[PDB]
Amino acid sequence: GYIEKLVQVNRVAKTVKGGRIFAFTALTVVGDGKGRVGFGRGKAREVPAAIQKAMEAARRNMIQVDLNGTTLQYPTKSAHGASKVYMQPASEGTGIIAGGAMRAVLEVAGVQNVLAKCYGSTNPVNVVYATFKGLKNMQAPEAVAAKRGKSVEE
RNA sequence: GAACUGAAGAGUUUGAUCAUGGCUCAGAUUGAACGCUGGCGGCAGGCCUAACACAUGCAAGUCGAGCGGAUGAAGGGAGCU
Ligand SMILES: [Mg+2]
Numbered sequence: 001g002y003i004e005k006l007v008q009v010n011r012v013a014k015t016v017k018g019g020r021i022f023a024f025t026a027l028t029v030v031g032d033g034k035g036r037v038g039f040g041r042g043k044a045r046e047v048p049a050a051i052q053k054a055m056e057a058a059r060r061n062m063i064q065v066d067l068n069g070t071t072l073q074y075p076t077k078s079a080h081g082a083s084k085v086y087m088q089p090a091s092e093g094t095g096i097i098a099g100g101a102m103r104a105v106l107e108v109a110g111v112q113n114v115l116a117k118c119y120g121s122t123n124p125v126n127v128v129y130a131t132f133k134g135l136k137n138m139q140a141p142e143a144v145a146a147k148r149g150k151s152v153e154e
Numbered sequence: 155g156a157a158c159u160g161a162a163g164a165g166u167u168u169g170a171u172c173a174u175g176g177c178u179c180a181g182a183u184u185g186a187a188c189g190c191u192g193g194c195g196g197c198a199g200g201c202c203u204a205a206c207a208c209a210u211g212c213a214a215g216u217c218g219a220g221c222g223g224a225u226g227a228a229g230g231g232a233g234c235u
Pocket residue numbers: 120121
């Protein structure tokens with residue numbers, strides 16, 4: 001998949017004798033818009049190098065997400081650290097009602113109707129972890145049918 | 155056949171980081187007031203304060219087919235003119 005979103009770019013510093021060394025960190029998300037999505041972090045002493053490292057890292061470790069035709073299966077509630085995330089499917093006319101990192105993640109993954117919200121700390125990287133944790137543990141029918149036959153469970 | 159369908163975050167504590175936590179901002183509303191500016195129309199609204207004191211007009215009268223009385227037309231005439 002090839003859809004690049006630059007979620008965040010930040011400048012960090014470390015102290016040595018002489019003064020400070022500055023570094024640049026980038027967090028990006030990659031996906032095809034039809035089920036696969038991954039995220040990557042990259043640090044360098046230059047912004048382009050950090051962004052390229054983040055893109056290369058995100059292009060690895062992609063995951064497959066089960067979705068109901070550009071729409072979620074059921075409401076989801078997922079947490080990582082101090083960040084908490086609520087999601088729930090919406091109708092066709094809706095867009096993406098989400099803020100910041102969540103919007104990039106959901107748009108990249110390929111869902112178009114998400115009506116989402118976040119509570120707790122709104123650190124973008126932790127929000128991205130929480131959003132992938134919610135999206136990855138999404139079952140969808142014919143997999144919850146491990147118990148018994150299908151069309152009777154629903 | 156309908157009577158609903160719906161939820162965004164950002165800045166700021168550090169050399170840098172995560173968390174906690176307060177402050178501030180982006181929206182929608184007023185019986186509003188003030189500053190600058192000002193063409194027209196339709197529909198509404200207009201003492202939120204002193205239940206403070208009030209000049210002057212008007213805002214509750216009608217019935218003569220309930221009853222006496224006094225006001226007494228036009229006319230028919232009568233006299234004198
Ligand atoms: Mg907080």
